[PDB]
Amino acid sequence: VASMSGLTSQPSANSLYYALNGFPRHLRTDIEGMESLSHYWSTVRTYYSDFESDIKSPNTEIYQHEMPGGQYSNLSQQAKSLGLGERFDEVKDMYRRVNFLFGDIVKVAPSSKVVGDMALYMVQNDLDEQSVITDGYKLDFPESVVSFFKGEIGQPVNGFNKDLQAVILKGQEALTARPGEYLEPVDFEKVR
Amino acid sequence: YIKDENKPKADKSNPSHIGAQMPGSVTEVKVSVGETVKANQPLLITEAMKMETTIQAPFDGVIKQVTVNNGDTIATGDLLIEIE
Ligand SMILES: *C(=O)CCCC[C@@H]1SC[C@@H]2NC(=O)N[C@@H]21
Numbered sequence A: 001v002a003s004m005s006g007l008t009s010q011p012s013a014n015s016l017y018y019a020l021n022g023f024p025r026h027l028r029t030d031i032e033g034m035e036s037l038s039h040y041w042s043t044v045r046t047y048y049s050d051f052e053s054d055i056k057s058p059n060t061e062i063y064q065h066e067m068p069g070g071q072y073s074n075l076s077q078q079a080k081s082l083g084l085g086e087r088f089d090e091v092k093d094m095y096r097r098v099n100f101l102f103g104d105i106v107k108v109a110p111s112s113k114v115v116g117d118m119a120l121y122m123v124q125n126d127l128d129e130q131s132v133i134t135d136g137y138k139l140d141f142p143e144s145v146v147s148f149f150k151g152e153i154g155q156p157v158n159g160f161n162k163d164l165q166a167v168i169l170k171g172q173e174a175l176t177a178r179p180g181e182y183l184e185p186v187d188f189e190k191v192r
Numbered sequence B: 001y002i003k004d005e006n007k008p009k010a011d012k013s014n015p016s017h018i019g020a021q022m023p024g025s026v027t028e029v030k031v032s033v034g035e036t037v038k039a040n041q042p043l044l045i046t047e048a049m050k051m052e053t054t055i056q057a058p059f060d061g062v063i064k065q066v067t068v069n070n071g072d073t074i075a076t077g078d079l080l081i082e083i084e
Helices: A013-019 A031-051 A071-081 A089-101 A111-124 A143-150 A162-166
Strands: B017-019 B024-029 B044-047 B052-055 B061-066 B079-083
Touching: A013 A031, A071 A111, A089 A111, A111 A143, A143 B052
Parallel strands: none
Antiparallel strands: B017 B079, B024 B044, B044 B052, B061 B079
């Protein structure tokens, strides 16, 4: 609805409704009703101002750093918590770098949260790509980022660089198959 | 000019200390004062918001000190373990 639409959210239904006037296909819904909802959610949203993201404008640079529109406000709160409020433009920049570092992957939950965590981590410590190319520095990487190189989240299409992956997990290494077909069922009875 | 009368750091260059890398809270301490430690060994479990860094062993030796208990708050570049 209009007042919960736009920017990192999805397009306004109210706006789309009128946009199709004249064009072959119309949107099947209630105009006046969505208007009525919009006014309601316009006021209710006012309760949640403290959680509003730092975007007030469309940004075309999202075509560069491919940050999910759902992760955005969630990750802002994360940076805000980790002493990285104000320094969130640098978190977006690294996010782009963390992607091409991983062989151009799909960034959604939780793979976005891995890139998300790798980005927040490397900014925190002023690390970069060549900080681990001939280096391969032991660093105590976050849960998600080592988890990903173990394959706990699956396999990316292009995989990981053999030598890249190695220096991020030295010891108990990678698993190949989809986690399910070795991970043994939970005993729900002992949980009860 | 008159003066009006009203946590340890770490090192990231030479010696093998263990500085905090994400600022947050300590969840679990596994390593004592005097104890043997081998390679890759987990030592200290610290937690952020949606983040969990379990601190491993970069070398292979004996613990000199522990600088955090249970539930202690850490900043980035803070001493935790010093190791030879
Ligand atoms: C904290 O407990 C709320 C979850 C915040 C993380 C969410 S999960 C889906 C989005 N994708 C992502 O990488 N982070 C966002």
